[PDB]
Write a protein that binds this DNA or RNA. Structure first.
Ligand SMILES: [Zn+2]
Length: 73
RNA sequence: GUGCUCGCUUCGGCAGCACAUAUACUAAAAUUGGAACGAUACAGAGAAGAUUAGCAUGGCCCCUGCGCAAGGAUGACACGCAAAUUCGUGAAGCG
């Protein structure tokens, strides 16, 4: 609508570093917490809970998902 | 260390007295371990977004800023909790 919102659409289009990405949520949160704010949210709690519950299924799960993706591309 | 005893009493020594009252992360540190929007290289506004409202509660936090300026950027599965009888139980009291 406005010049500011349009510039913000440019920025928010710009796709950036993992530093705020959480896989457990698959939520690339944003801007100076991201990850720890997942953690604060009850979600990341249940999620890292399940992770510690079955640590060596997620490693392999993701490893493959990625691996097939890379062959694909 | 200063000064004094009609001090021993010479001027050499000893004593007694008057004071003068307790520095200081004392270490040459012993040790201990890290990050850049840096260089290159790439790459190229990557539409995917209409996510159809805003303000709250609230301590959800960090940054710029001298700010009781100003300004950034963020958290929603925010719920089931149950007023309400029914008997049973025990306790008390009265006869
Ligand atoms: Zn997360």
């Amino acid at each position: 609508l406005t010049p500011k919102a349009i510039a913000n659409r440019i920025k928010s289009k710009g796709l950036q570093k993992l530093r705020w990405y959480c896989q457990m949520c698959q939520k690339q949160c944003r801007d100076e917490n991201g990850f720890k704010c997942h953690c604060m949210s009850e979600s990341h709690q249940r999620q890292l809970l399940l992770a510690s519950e079955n640590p060596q299924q997620f490693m392999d799960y993701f490893s493959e998902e990625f691996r097939n993706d890379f062959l694909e591309l």
